[PDB]
């Protein structure tokens, strides 16, 4: 134990990026409006399109009537880049508008360009939500503006944030930019923690609901460690940033992340029956990191249950065949086959 800090907000979570370990939490599964935090997913999808080379940063996109308050009353009063039908705008520019400025028109213009329409793009958003395990998340819009059945949770927001960092790091990289210039005007990042002197914060997104309050998904680094915090429904802007600071600060001060089983390390070797190899290497894959109170490494040692007491071919790389459990004078992860073994012939 380390006593968890008190947090003045509707819901929050603090999570280690490498281990996935939840260090502190309150109401972390309560369905709440994500508002502009929705744009983390928007960026995830745009990120995937860029990484797959289905779109390029230099591609010019033609802005439709849907991307303009005049032509889409839903945009009235919201953050926008001020795009007009027929404008030609860089993917790179519209991408910065989504990420740095949270421009709701940039969201629409890029959704159409990527997926041909908003509804198709929202389909990709929910598809990835299901893929990434966001069991309590449903997106109904590409920008996060108020819609009937649209919700997420602190926990799901931290999972999504971890995915953005891990899966599309070039897109994550843009979220630390303090400004960008469009139409000769500089546009500020409203993530005030990018300016903190007390932390090295590099993301991710701010949001304000209809009337629950002020939301932040933040990520920071210290030495080799990275934490993600989510604070949902704080009463003020100040508290939103301050409680987020307090969590990240506490996690780095008292905990450390260690990796006793590296990816590609063998943890145990096991006999395999009836295969083209007589034994198979079993490991943790990428999930061998654990978050522990500082100084406790000495006192930590690892274990597993073999499920099926008896391994029989065929075995497939990554196939999970049991369970690693971590022990402090604590955490559990699949024990996985690290190489394929076909049936003998």
Cα 185 from Cα 187, distance rounded (Å): 6
Complete DSSP assignment for 240-290: HHHHHHHHHHHHHHHEEEE-SS-TT--SEEEE-BSBSSSEEEEE-TT---E
Instruction: Please tell me whether residues 87 and 136 are part of one structural domain.
Output: yes
Our CA angle for 134, 136, 138, nearest 5°, is 85
Instruction: Please tell me whether residues 91 and 181 are part of one structural domain.
Output: yes
Domain ends where: 235, 254, 273? 254
Q: Are 272 and 315 in contact (CB under 8 A)?
A: yes
Nearest in space to 288 (alpha carbons), one of 313, 324, 317: 324
Instruction: Please tell me whether residues 284 and 170 are part of one structural domain.
Output: no
298 burial via Cβ count (<10 Å: 0-12, 13-18, 19+): exposed
Structural domain for 52, as ranges: 1-254
Q: Which residues pair with 328 in a beta bridge?
A: 300
Instruction: Please tell me whether residues 211 and 115 are part of one structural domain.
Output: yes
Q: Which residues pair with 336 in a beta bridge?
A: 283, 320
Residue 261: how many CB atoms within 10 A of its CB? 21
Nearest in space to 61 (alpha carbons), one of 78, 83, 39: 83
Cα 93 from Cα 57, distance rounded (Å): 8
Q: Could you tell me the end-to-end alpha-carbon distance of the chain, in angstroms, rounded to an integer?
A: 53
Instruction: Please tell me whether residues 204 and 322 are part of one structural domain.
Output: no
CATH number at residue 86: 3.40.710.10
Instruction: Please tell me whether residues 70 and 184 are part of one structural domain.
Output: yes
Domain ends where: 219, 254, 289? 254
The residues annotated with a catalytic role in the active site are 36, 39, 102
Residue 209: how many CB atoms within 10 A of its CB? 19
Instruction: Please tell me whether residues 201 and 95 are part of one structural domain.
Output: yes
Q: What is the resolution of this structure in A?
A: 1.8
Domain ends where: 228, 254, 280? 254
Instruction: Please tell me whether residues 218 and 75 are part of one structural domain.
Output: yes
- Structure determined via: X-ray
CATH number at residue 333: 2.60.410.10
Instruction: Please tell me whether residues 270 and 250 are part of one structural domain.
Output: no
What's the total number of domains in the chain? 2
Residues 6+ apart with CB under 8 A from 142: 38, 42, 107, 108, 111, 118, 121, 122, 125
Instruction: Please tell me whether residues 284 and 236 are part of one structural domain.
Output: no
Instruction: Please tell me whether residues 249 and 259 are part of one structural domain.
Output: no
Cα 72 from Cα 141, distance rounded (Å): 13
Q: In what order do the strands lie in the sheet with 320-328?
A: 268-271, 279-283, 331-337, 320-328, 300-306
Instruction: Please tell me whether residues 159 and 130 are part of one structural domain.
Output: yes
Query: Is 205 annotated as contributing to ligand binding?
Result: yes
């Amino acid at each position: 134990t380390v006593e968890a800090p008190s947090v003045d907000a509707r819901a929050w979570i603090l999570m280690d990026y490498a281990s996935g370990k939840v260090l502190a939490e309150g109401n972390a599964d309560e369905k709440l409006d994500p508002a502009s935090l929705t744009k983390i997913m928007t960026s995830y999808v745009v990120g995937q399109a860029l990484k797959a080379d289905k779109i390029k940063l230099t591609d010019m996109v033609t802005v439709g009537k849907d991307a303009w308050a005049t032509g889409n009353p839903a945009l009235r009063g919201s953050s926008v880049m001020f795009l007009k039908p027929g404008d030609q705008v860089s993917v790179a520019d519209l991408n910065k508008g989504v990420i740095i400025q949270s421009g709701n028109d940039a969201c629409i213009a890029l959704a159409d360009y990527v997926a041909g329409s908003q509804e198709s793009f929202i389909g990709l958003m929910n598809g990835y939500a299901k893929k990434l395990g966001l069991t309590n998340t449903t997106f109904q819009t590409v920008h996060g503006l108020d819609a009937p059945g649209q919700f997420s949770t602190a926990r799901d927001m931290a999972l999504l944030g971890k995915a953005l960092i891990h899966d599309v790091p070039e897109e994550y990289a843009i979220h630390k930019e303090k400004e960008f210039t469009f139409n000769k005007i500089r546009q500020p990042n409203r993530n005030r923690l990018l300016w903190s002197s007390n932390l090295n914060v590099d993301g991710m997104k701010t949001g304000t609901t209809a009337g629950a309050g002020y939301n932040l998904v933040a990520s920071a680094t210290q030495g080799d460690m990275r934490l993600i915090s989510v604070v949902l429904g704080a009463k003020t802007d100040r508290i939103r940033f301050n409680e987020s600071e307090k969590l990240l600060t506490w996690g780095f001060r008292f905990f450390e992340t260690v990796t006793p089983i590296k990816p590609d390390a063998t943890f145990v070797t096991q006999r395999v029956w009836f295969g083209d190899k007589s034994e198979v290497n079993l490991g943790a894959g990428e999930a061998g990191s654990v978050t522990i109170p500082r100084g406790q490494l000495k006192n930590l040692k690892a274990s597993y249950t073999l499920t099926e007491p008896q391994l029989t071919a065929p075995l497939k790389k990554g196939q999970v065949v049991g369970t690693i459990d971590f022990q402090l004078n604590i955490e559990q992860r699949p024990l996985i086959v690290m190489e394929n073994v076909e049936e003998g012939g």
